[PDB]
Amino acid sequence: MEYRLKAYYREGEKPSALRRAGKLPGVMYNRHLNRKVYVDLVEFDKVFRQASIHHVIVLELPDGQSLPTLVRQVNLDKRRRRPEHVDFFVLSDEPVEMYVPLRFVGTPAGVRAGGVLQEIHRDILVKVSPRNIPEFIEVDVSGLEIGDSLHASDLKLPPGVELAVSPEETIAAVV
Amino acid sequence: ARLTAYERRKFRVRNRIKRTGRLRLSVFRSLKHIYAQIIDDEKGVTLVSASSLALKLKGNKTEVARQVGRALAEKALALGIKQVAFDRGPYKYHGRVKALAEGAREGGLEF
Amino acid sequence: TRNGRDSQAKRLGVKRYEGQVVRAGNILVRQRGTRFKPGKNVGMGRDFTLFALVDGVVEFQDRGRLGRYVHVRPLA
Amino acid sequence: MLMPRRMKYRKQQRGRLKGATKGGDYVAFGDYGLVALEPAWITAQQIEAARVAMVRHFRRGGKIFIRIFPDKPYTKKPLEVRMGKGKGNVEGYVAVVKPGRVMFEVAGVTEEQAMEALRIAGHKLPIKTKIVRRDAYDEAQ
RNA sequence: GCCGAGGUGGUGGAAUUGGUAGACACGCUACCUUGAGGUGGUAGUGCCCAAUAGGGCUUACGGGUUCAAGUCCCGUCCUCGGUACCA
RNA sequence: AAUCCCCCGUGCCCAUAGCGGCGUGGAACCACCCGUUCCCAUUCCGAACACGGAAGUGAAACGCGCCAGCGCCGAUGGUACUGGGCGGGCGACCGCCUGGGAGAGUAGGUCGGUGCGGGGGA
RNA sequence: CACCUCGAUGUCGGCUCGUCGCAUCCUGGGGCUGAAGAAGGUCCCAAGGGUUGGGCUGUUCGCCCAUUAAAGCGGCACGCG
RNA sequence: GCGGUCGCCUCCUAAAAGGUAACGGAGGCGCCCAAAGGUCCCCUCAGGCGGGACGGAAAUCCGCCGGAGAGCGCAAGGGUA
RNA sequence: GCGCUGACUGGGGCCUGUAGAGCACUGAUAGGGCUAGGGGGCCCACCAGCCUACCAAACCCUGUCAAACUCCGAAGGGUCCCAGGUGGAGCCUGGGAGUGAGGGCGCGAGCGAUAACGUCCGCGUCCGAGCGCGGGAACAACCGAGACCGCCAGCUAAGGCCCCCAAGUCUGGGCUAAGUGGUAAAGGAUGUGGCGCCGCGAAGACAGCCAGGAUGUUGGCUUAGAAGCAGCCAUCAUUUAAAGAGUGCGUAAUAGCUCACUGGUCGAGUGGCGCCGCGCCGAAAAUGAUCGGGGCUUAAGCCCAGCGCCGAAGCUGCGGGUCU
Ligand SMILES: [Mg+2]
Ligand SMILES: [Mg+2]
Ligand SMILES: [Mg+2]
Ligand SMILES: [Mg+2]
Ligand SMILES: [Mg+2]
Ligand SMILES: [Mg+2]
Ligand SMILES: [Mg+2]
Ligand SMILES: [Mg+2]
Ligand SMILES: [Mg+2]
Ligand SMILES: [Mg+2]
Ligand SMILES: [Mg+2]
Ligand SMILES: [Mg+2]
Ligand SMILES: [Mg+2]
Ligand SMILES: [Mg+2]
Ligand SMILES: [Mg+2]
Ligand SMILES: [Mg+2]
Ligand SMILES: [Mg+2]
Ligand SMILES: [Mg+2]
Ligand SMILES: [Mg+2]
Ligand SMILES: [Mg+2]
Ligand SMILES: [Mg+2]
Ligand SMILES: [Mg+2]
Ligand SMILES: [Mg+2]
Ligand SMILES: [Mg+2]
Ligand SMILES: [Mg+2]
Ligand SMILES: [Mg+2]
Ligand SMILES: [Mg+2]
Ligand SMILES: [Mg+2]
Ligand SMILES: [Mg+2]
Ligand SMILES: [Mg+2]
Ligand SMILES: [Mg+2]
Ligand SMILES: [Mg+2]
Ligand SMILES: [Mg+2]
Ligand SMILES: [Mg+2]
Ligand SMILES: [Mg+2]
Ligand SMILES: [Mg+2]
Ligand SMILES: [Mg+2]
Ligand SMILES: [Mg+2]
Ligand SMILES: [Mg+2]
Ligand SMILES: [Mg+2]
Ligand SMILES: [Mg+2]
Ligand SMILES: [Mg+2]
Ligand SMILES: [Mg+2]
Ligand SMILES: [Mg+2]
Ligand SMILES: [Mg+2]
Ligand SMILES: [Mg+2]
Ligand SMILES: [Mg+2]
Ligand SMILES: [Mg+2]
Ligand SMILES: [Mg+2]
Ligand SMILES: [Mg+2]
Ligand SMILES: [Mg+2]
Ligand SMILES: [Mg+2]
Ligand SMILES: [Mg+2]
Ligand SMILES: [Mg+2]
Ligand SMILES: [Mg+2]
Ligand SMILES: [Mg+2]
Ligand SMILES: [Mg+2]
Ligand SMILES: [Mg+2]
Ligand SMILES: [Mg+2]
Ligand SMILES: [Mg+2]
Ligand SMILES: [Mg+2]
Ligand SMILES: [Mg+2]
Ligand SMILES: [Mg+2]
Ligand SMILES: [Mg+2]
Ligand SMILES: [Mg+2]
Ligand SMILES: [Mg+2]
Ligand SMILES: [Mg+2]
Ligand SMILES: [Mg+2]
Ligand SMILES: [Mg+2]
Ligand SMILES: [Mg+2]
Ligand SMILES: [Mg+2]
Ligand SMILES: [Mg+2]
Ligand SMILES: [Mg+2]
Ligand SMILES: [Mg+2]
Ligand SMILES: [Mg+2]
Ligand SMILES: [Mg+2]
Ligand SMILES: [Mg+2]
Ligand SMILES: [Mg+2]
Ligand SMILES: [Mg+2]
Ligand SMILES: [Mg+2]
Ligand SMILES: [Mg+2]
Ligand SMILES: [Mg+2]
Ligand SMILES: [Mg+2]
Ligand SMILES: [Mg+2]
Ligand SMILES: [Mg+2]
Ligand SMILES: [Mg+2]
Ligand SMILES: [Mg+2]
Ligand SMILES: [Mg+2]
Ligand SMILES: [Mg+2]
Ligand SMILES: [Mg+2]
Ligand SMILES: [Mg+2]
Ligand SMILES: [Mg+2]
Ligand SMILES: [Mg+2]
Ligand SMILES: [Mg+2]
Ligand SMILES: [Mg+2]
Ligand SMILES: [Mg+2]
Ligand SMILES: [Mg+2]
Ligand SMILES: [Mg+2]
Ligand SMILES: [Mg+2]
Question: Which residue from D20, D21, D137 is facing A83, i.e. has the nearest CB?
Fold first, then answer.
């Protein structure tokens, strides 16, 4: 649930060079501040595979600090589908917006053995308090039924806060 | 419902006027009173004012108009201003709008 | 082949740019619709052609929603 | 095979292939994918042979995606003729594919299975390819 | 050997513009009719367990395409119009 | 005249000023309103336009506020592309140097700003 | 395609004389066989030599008769006036 | 040679000024209108939903929503409430 | 004749809709969702009517494409102004022309087959007319460089420095074992050198080597019999450190053998996935072979660094000519 990164500071130095030196460029920003940094590619990869804009990265970084950051965009060059720039979003005391995984729980969900699990969104956009950050979200109902649909307001929704628009959407069905 | 016969007709007649280059004798008339304003565009500035609600007069608003009509001349003609165009905006050239114009006599005019 | 046709290039466009000195007559823009609208001291002929109305210099104005304008600000 | 019905214009130039995959580009439907390493025109009849090869090696279930589509009209004279006098004539359709693009991509199957299918499917293509899984990065939206 | 079309019950052959058949026909079997027949008219009839019900197989043969193929893709054999240096 | 608040005119910027929800304003302005004699009217209608009035109402409209659901605006990094200069691959194409540097997207921002002139206030 | 040749680079086929390539028709040597043997199939090595006589047609080609270890495919200005 | 073409307008090709070729990709003109002309005054569409005898997808009518996707005699483009 | 106006350059304004990107319009388009109506399949034949395993409008998500699409939009380019710029610059008037068959290359497109020493335009360049000079083995247009004349002087450019052949068998560090270099692809491979991730492993793996293999049994189904070892299969279940009614031989259904399995020995690494550098296969044409040749293997090959030298008709020194 807790991922450590590291970091450094950028001002000059062409990203081309950093790139060459195993380091991965990137910026750090939010309502209050904005500064350019660079992580270690080999390191960052290890973290992001598991992290993945779903969980929080604390970002060490000289300055001795440890900043609460979500990753809000990853630019990867298409030719080799490897990353080439990460930008980290730092959390403060004010509800944010993010993506939360969807633990497809329950069973074949009604009419079991069998039916259609119908996987739509392994994530979901939610406006939530930076303090309480759901590790995931239980998606069960029971279940379930045949040719039904768990909209969105039917879902669990832990004591985070709420949804992010889209009151009515798929997420569930059997056909 | 975007823009209205009012707003439209307003631009239509007022846009034409602003092409000819002259000073604008803009006429706003309300239910109770009728006001008049000599404006210079490109300078975005008014030169001679003449209301009825500013001359505290009353009694038959077609006759009041003409008064604030002649009132505009006097005040204005004394500033050099002689020739002008005359707005008319949304109002048909009639009644108290026509009246004020007919009052604008004793001052440049051609109307 | 059923194709093979085309028409003579009409050499359309702006003829005087901003900050160019012109003269009453000088046509300033050749265009199809009203891509530019006649501003100060700028006439426009039956083929939508903009020309100086007086001498002076050329200046352009982008009135956004109101379109783009060519003015001939005097100096004469 | 696979052509786009109703077209504003038949016969279109050819343009170049200097691009680098508009995108794309990051997998977005399945568990695994086939990515294009080289630029090429992929023919509807090449796509159909790649699709079939998979649905076939998948017993019949299966769940392709393709993601590339032949909307470009490919012309060609009637051979035995000389230049001039009209153009090509249209003898099929192609899809334009620069590096990066994700073609096909499958889901709902094992790994040692999906990966064997994508390999087969890849042999039907005139370019070099690459098999992918799909990690966070892919979740670029 | 080369390009296009088509191969169907015992026979002739249609649906061939995308959706559930081996039509109406000629046999053949029984029936009406006749003194008995011919013709004509009913009804059975592609195949097999089927009382019917209804399972399932048919579109030259085999292999894939699609939810579905007599039809789209090919391969083999059969056939019809074509067609194969060269100065 | 100074400063300021509200309101009526009229400009300019041309969506950060817009849609929508809610709330407010009638002393004054404005509107609606009250009438259709008169000027003048509606291919029918005093709806509009127009005149004469003013009892009534801020319901409509308009003005002023608040709300970021939509709309609009939108960096910073990083790329794409590319002047110019060099390389590489059979090619299709690719890379380096030096200058310029988007688009999308992210963080955000916004439910206006201001000119002149009036009327009323302090 | 129109690059040398239009102050000329004679054009099919046959005959004659060859020579070269091997993607080998036969003969030599091999592996595999759904190779019992004999006889084949298929692939590999191998260009030393060999690779028939007739009917038809200008024909090349091809069909056919009789044979054969086999009746090889190509290049050489579709080799060679 | 046969075929096609030959002047004029629109669009692309055309590499963000102009211009730019090919038997390159696609269309159109050889008219028309005494009002489809001048001026002054008014008016604002297309659609979508709801409502309404004969009215039907669509005749005429009422309501809300509708910045132009309508219209501008005919091609296309630019333009335009 | 006028004479600082020229190309080019700096700063500033204005014009543009391409490259790129985008999907807001015009169209194209993958999947899913929700729903006009139909395919239907049908209840009726009076409303009807239920369902969607084919459509499929719009609408919503997730994805994309476009020369004749653009909500966007660089770099550049055009033009004017003010500056620099005296140049075989510019402008004006006039005398004389020749050319109006271009070609290669680079870049951007169309045609063609993402063929042509193809063809047609655009912007550049060279050959044309520099078939003069150096390099590229030889070679109009690729690299270098614009040849006034003379020199038995010097420095350089490209390219080179083992010998033919001028100058290093020069100094480091790595790579390659093919003569690769001296090449042709999809694809393929315990070649070789590096980087990395994962699985197992001193509770001791991986090679081998000892030990044992069920049992009701023929499993039943098929079926003289299939008894694992014809076949279809229901493929049991127990027990065990541990053997699947049995993977392969055997096969008058048997016998016997053997294996996936655990114990012991030995004891150390072992197995798999990627990644880069250089190589390997893929690899058959016609007269005599060859990288220009000889020849080259810690290189006389490839990559990274360096220091020197050789090298043109470029530059320099010396003298000379002619024009301005
Ligand atoms: Mg042309
Ligand atoms: Mg044109
Ligand atoms: Mg602009
Ligand atoms: Mg994208
Ligand atoms: Mg029948
Ligand atoms: Mg009888
Ligand atoms: Mg009898
Ligand atoms: Mg009888
Ligand atoms: Mg009888
Ligand atoms: Mg058939
Ligand atoms: Mg079949
Ligand atoms: Mg106001
Ligand atoms: Mg806007
Ligand atoms: Mg509002
Ligand atoms: Mg109130
Ligand atoms: Mg209000
Ligand atoms: Mg009151
Ligand atoms: Mg009152
Ligand atoms: Mg109100
Ligand atoms: Mg008000
Ligand atoms: Mg943006
Ligand atoms: Mg930027
Ligand atoms: Mg931006
Ligand atoms: Mg605010
Ligand atoms: Mg005041
Ligand atoms: Mg010639
Ligand atoms: Mg030529
Ligand atoms: Mg001669
Ligand atoms: Mg001769
Ligand atoms: Mg062979
Ligand atoms: Mg032999
Ligand atoms: Mg034998
Ligand atoms: Mg043999
Ligand atoms: Mg051989
Ligand atoms: Mg003869
Ligand atoms: Mg022969
Ligand atoms: Mg013959
Ligand atoms: Mg013979
Ligand atoms: Mg011979
Ligand atoms: Mg020949
Ligand atoms: Mg000959
Ligand atoms: Mg002779
Ligand atoms: Mg002869
Ligand atoms: Mg002719
Ligand atoms: Mg242009
Ligand atoms: Mg309507
Ligand atoms: Mg209606
Ligand atoms: Mg209705
Ligand atoms: Mg329009
Ligand atoms: Mg039109
Ligand atoms: Mg248009
Ligand atoms: Mg238009
Ligand atoms: Mg000067
Ligand atoms: Mg210039
Ligand atoms: Mg300049
Ligand atoms: Mg634009
Ligand atoms: Mg493009
Ligand atoms: Mg679109
Ligand atoms: Mg559409
Ligand atoms: Mg769809
Ligand atoms: Mg474009
Ligand atoms: Mg256009
Ligand atoms: Mg923008
Ligand atoms: Mg410039
Ligand atoms: Mg400039
Ligand atoms: Mg100067
Ligand atoms: Mg000269
Ligand atoms: Mg001259
Ligand atoms: Mg002369
Ligand atoms: Mg000529
Ligand atoms: Mg010529
Ligand atoms: Mg030319
Ligand atoms: Mg030239
Ligand atoms: Mg040229
Ligand atoms: Mg050459
Ligand atoms: Mg290049
Ligand atoms: Mg070429
Ligand atoms: Mg040429
Ligand atoms: Mg060049
Ligand atoms: Mg010449
Ligand atoms: Mg030369
Ligand atoms: Mg020259
Ligand atoms: Mg020569
Ligand atoms: Mg030479
Ligand atoms: Mg040389
Ligand atoms: Mg030379
Ligand atoms: Mg010289
Ligand atoms: Mg010299
Ligand atoms: Mg030297
Ligand atoms: Mg050098
Ligand atoms: Mg050498
Ligand atoms: Mg030497
Ligand atoms: Mg040495
Ligand atoms: Mg060394
Ligand atoms: Mg062991
Ligand atoms: Mg047993
Ligand atoms: Mg050599
Ligand atoms: Mg000298
Ligand atoms: Mg001279």
Answer: D137
